[PDB]
Each structure stands twice: as C-alpha cells, then as structure tokens.
C-alpha cells in the first residue's frame, strides 16, 4: 500500500497549482469526513489570500529610514506612519490566520488519529482529510519561506512598536501592547507558521491523554516516509514526481518531520525515531540548492533535538 499512499497524497496536484483548498467533487470525502472537510476547506480557501498578501508585502524601509534620519520633520514621521500602518495590518491578519490553522489542525488530528485504526489505514480511510493535512503543511512551509527572505517584516513591526508607544505620549484597527507581544514572539521565529503548528500538535497530544502517542507520531512519520520514498525512488519519480508534486512533497515532508521532532519524546533523530533523517536530508540535497534553502533552514533552526548529544554527527554534518 506504499504505492497506494503515494497515489493518494500526490493525487490531482499536478493539474492543481498554488491552490491549498481541495475541490469537493475531486477529493470526494466520505460521510464521516464531511463536517471537518468543510471546516478545514474554509481555512484553506483563505490560505491562498494570506500567501498572496505576503508576496505583495513591500515593506516601509524607505520611509522608516528617512523619518529616523530627519526626526524633527513631522511630514516624514507621518509619511512613514501612513506607510507602515497598512503593513502592520497585514502582519495582524497573518498572525490571526495562524490561530485559524491551529483550529483546523485539531479537527484533522482528531480524525486521522483515532484509537482503532492504524496510521496507514487512516490515510487510506480518510483520504480527503489526509490531503488537507498535507495542504496545511504546504501553506505553512511556503509562508515561512517568504518570511525568511523578507527582513522588512520584523523591521516594520519593531518600528511600529517604538513609534506607537512614544506617539501616544507626545501625540480602532490599532494593535494593543498585549497582542503586539504575541506578534513579536511570532515574527521572531525563523518559521512562524511551523512553530505555531508545532505547538498545536503538542497541544493535541495533551488534550487527548487517553489517546496513545503513536497514533499521532506514526501518522506524521508515515507521511514523511510516503514523501521520502516518492522523491528518492526513480521508478516512482518518473510515475508521479513532477514540478509541482516534488515541491509539494518536499514541504509536506519537512513539515511532518519538525512536528514529529517536537511531539515524539526522543525526537526525530534518536535511534527509535521512525523517520529516515539521512534519507530526508539527502532528498533535499539532491534538489537544486536555491529552491530548498528555506526548508534546510527550517530543519536547522525550528528543530528541537538537532543539537542533542545523542543526535548523530552524520546528519549534523549533512546539514552544514
């Protein structure tokens, strides 16, 4: 069923491009998937809009530097303020969309990690919900890759917090200090959406104490092995791996790996891990370097157990 699971996750994504929501007629969920598929699909419909706003994030570095250069010129102070406020509005909408990702993740984890079935049978039984989980990770990695290449995001928000505080001394859709602190910890992360999704998966394990942990962890490791085997085998590469399919699976694999490393007690690098770390890193290495550097940075920074003394030197040196 390893070939079937590949045909399930990599199904109808070639003719698909940049769309994170699943077509209802194409995915064809079962009766037991309808109430969750509908909820998750609404969040996935907005994921494309969130990602497009991040691509259009030009930043206010030019106006900020000019205002700081001439701090007595009120026209330049208001020109920078008029430019950075709609951008902080976008940053506000991105962080609030991260909270919606946590809700849609618990609906998927709640169904894909039931007590009786195995991970392999869950991805085959609840095929539509398994596709949505991969699409949530797809957007998560694609969002965090843009954030890493856009240094104006943290500079715009830091200048906002400095100017706000001291403007409401000297001088509705405004941001409060309580929300700003959570946004600052959000954008200080190398992978903001993935860190959030990582905590949400840890929350799911704690909310379901009566649920065994491998029902969640082996679901992530199965998805990692489905993507790894598809990408590393040429027999399966000439059958399924295309431009959009490889880029999709590369990001689904890195997503579940980091989730696994935070939820699985010993991590994804220990001897008892079920993720082929060397094989997953190698697949990233055989890819063109520029298109995967964001994913490699995720495996080097968002990881919990990478720098452990129990962790191997081969992968440690593999990620150098």
The 10 Å Cβ neighbour count of residue 289 is: 9
φ/ψ of 315, rounded to 5, equals -75, -40
Distance (Å, rounded) from C-alpha 152 to C-alpha 145? 14
Q: How far is CA 179 from the centre of its chain?
A: 21
What's the alpha-carbon Rg for the chain, to the nearest Å? 21
The 10 Å Cβ neighbour count of residue 19 is: 13
Enter the tokens of residue 304: 């919990």
The 10 Å Cβ neighbour count of residue 171 is: 11
- Residue span of the structural domain in which 53 resides: 2-318
Is the CB of residue 183 less than 8 Å from the CB of residue 92?
yes
Q: For residues 55-76, b (16+ Cβ closer than 10 Å) or e, as one string?
A: eebebbbebbeebeeeeeeeeb
The domain total for the chain is 1
Distance (Å, rounded) from C-alpha 63 to C-alpha 152? 12
Nearest CA to 306 among 268, 279, 257? Answer: 268
Is the CB of residue 192 less than 8 Å from the CB of residue 186?
yes
Say which residues have a Cβ less than 8 Å from residue 38's Cβ, sequence separation at least 6.
none
CA angle 315–319–320, rounded 5-degree value = 115
The 10 Å Cβ neighbour count of residue 234 is: 8
Distance (Å, rounded) from C-alpha 130 to C-alpha 236? 20
Distance (Å, rounded) from C-alpha 272 to C-alpha 60? 48
Nearest CA to 239 among 22, 27, 4? Answer: 4
274: part of which helix (H) or strand (E)? none
φ/ψ of 319, rounded to 5, equals -85, 0
CA angle 283–219–112, rounded 5-degree value = 135
Distance (Å, rounded) from C-alpha 64 to C-alpha 134? 39
């Amino acid at each position: 069923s390893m070939g079937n699971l590949i045909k399930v996750l990599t199904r109808d994504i070639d003719h698909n491009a940049s769309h994170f929501f699943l077509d209802f007629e194409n995915a064809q969920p079962t009766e037991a998937e309808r109430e969750i598929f509908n909820q998750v699909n609404v969040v996935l419909k907005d994921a494309e809009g969130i990602l497009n706003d991040l691509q259009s994030y030009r930043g206010a570095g030019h106006e900020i530097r000019e205002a700081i250069q001439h701090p007595n010129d009120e026209n330049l102070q208001e020109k920078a303020w008029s430019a950075v406020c709609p951008l902080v509005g976008k940053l506000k909408k991105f962080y609030e969309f991260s909270q919606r990702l946590e809700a849609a993740l618990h609906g998927l984890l709640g169904a894909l990690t039931s007590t009786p079935y195995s991970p392999t049978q869950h991805l085959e039984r609840e095929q539509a919900l398994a596709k949505q989980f991969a699409e949530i990770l797809h957007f998560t990695l694609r969002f965090d890759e843009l954030k890493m290449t856009n240094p104006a995001i943290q500079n715009d928000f830091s200048y906002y917090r400095r100017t706000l505080s001291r403007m409401r001394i000297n001088n509705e859709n405004e941001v409060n200090n309580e929300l700003a602190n959570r946004m600052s910890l959000f954008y200080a992360e190398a992978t903001p959406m993935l860190k959030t999704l990582s905590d949400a998966t840890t929350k799911f394990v704690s909310d379901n104490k009566s649920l065994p942990i491998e029902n969640t962890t082996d679901c992530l490791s199965t998805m990692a092995s489905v993507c790894r085997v598809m990408l590393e085998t040429p027999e399966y590469r000439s059958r399924f791996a295309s431009e959009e399919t490889v880029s999709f699976c590369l990001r689904v694999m890195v997503g579940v790996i980091i989730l696994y490393d935070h939820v699985h007690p010993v991590g994804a690098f220990a001897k008892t891990s079920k993720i082929d770390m060397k094989g997953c890193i190698k697949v990233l290495k055989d890819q063109p370097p520029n298109s995967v550097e964001g994913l490699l940075n995720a495996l080097r920074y968002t990881t919990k157990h990478l720098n452990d003394e129990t962790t191997s030197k081969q992968i440690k040196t593999m990620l150098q």
